[PDB]
């Protein structure tokens, strides 16, 4: 069972990594492979038969690749303890003056904060664009801005408080992680198996 | 697609992502005028960027011998083995052989990372299981957290899970691994005041 995955970055780098590490304490000797990228690169790759399952972080369809629901998550705004946007109301007028930290268009976390948060902020001031999220963590954290990412992302650093999680007067940014396969490929019982970890 | 004339810096993993993120903070706060972008990848994908003269400067974390770019010490940068405090590796005197018995998770081809733990660890060991590749540092290191066999990734990535103690640096019998990260621009390169000055924020 030499299962193969592609996970968007969220996914491949703050979630699978513990669904990994147990899923090798009970099979030490069985081939994992993962790769990490952004949608279309998950989406291409089964596409391709080069990968057995995909797992992305934002609805992006193709023909022939199924996709089924798998995990909530919930987006959050976050900041520097020492943040300006700390020092008053967290109004959305002053959220859009804050200078944003985001993603590039393409990896299913900015696609979502632009519909769910970042719409609703009018002439919002877009400060850089990162094509990883670790340095938007760092970035943040040094006071270059604000930004909006998955709370599985920044946890660590809310529970040391290097990072804060802010209040927004807006829904909780909830979205959904989706698991795809091919059409034609069938399921085998090692993947099966890994399927269950990731429960 | 248009080009914004912003300062464009390209660099490699470790320094992109646990370097720079301070270094732009900083020039932000006193340029606030100026955009900034910055791209992170493998050192290769700095110098084809600097060669192609698509970004103004470049870091990169291994030696780059070509006679077009014009390379400057700026670093030094040290690589150590880790691991999550419970693992069986922080019990008892490290040898090569237990190291070797540990399965190891490795950056890939190409990161620079791979390449010298290659050479300056990996090589010493009689025989060593690959548990996985991976292609980012980050992964590696929440692997390694959540108890996935060890890992050799420069102190930077880890610093903050040393301090709080979610990972340990492991004492392995073998000089320390070291590498010099550098600043690069093209020869032909003209260094604006504005680059010049962001070059200097580098230190």
């Not at 979630?15 to 147990?22: K, S, Y």
């Not at 993962?34 to 990968?51: H, I, K, P, T």
């Not at 604000?146 to 920044?154: A, D, W």
């Not at 529970?159 to 909780?172: A, I, Q």
Request: include cysteine; charge should be negative; hydrophobic fraction near 45%.
């Amino acid at each position: 069972g030499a299962i193969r995955v592609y996970a968007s970055s969220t996914i491949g780098n703050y979630i699978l990594p513990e669904i990994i590490a147990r899923y090798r304490r009970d099979f030490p000797d069985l081939p994992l492979e993962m790769s990490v990228g952004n949608s279309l690169d998950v989406v291409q790759a089964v596409c391709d038969f080069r990968v057995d399952i995909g797992l992305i972080e934002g609805p992006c369809h193709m023909a022939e690749i199924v996709a089924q629901p798998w995990l909530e998550d919930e987006l959050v705004v976050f900041a520097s303890p020492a943040s300006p946007l700390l020092e008053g109301e967290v109004t959305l007028e002053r959220l859009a003056a804050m200078p944003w930290i985001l993603r590039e268009k393409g990896s299913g976390t900015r696609e979502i904060v632009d519909y769910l948060l970042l719409s609703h902020l009018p002439q919002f001031r877009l400060s850089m664009e990162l094509g990883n999220s670790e340095a938007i963590k760092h970035a943040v954290r040094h006071g270059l801005g604000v930004s909006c990412l998955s709370r599985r992302v920044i946890a660590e650093q809310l529970e040391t408080g290097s990072l804060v999680e802010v209040k927004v007067p807006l829904p909780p940014l909830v979205r959904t992680l989706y698991r795809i396969h091919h059409r034609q490929k069938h399921l085998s019982s090692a993947l099966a198996r890994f399927l269950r970890y990731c429960e």
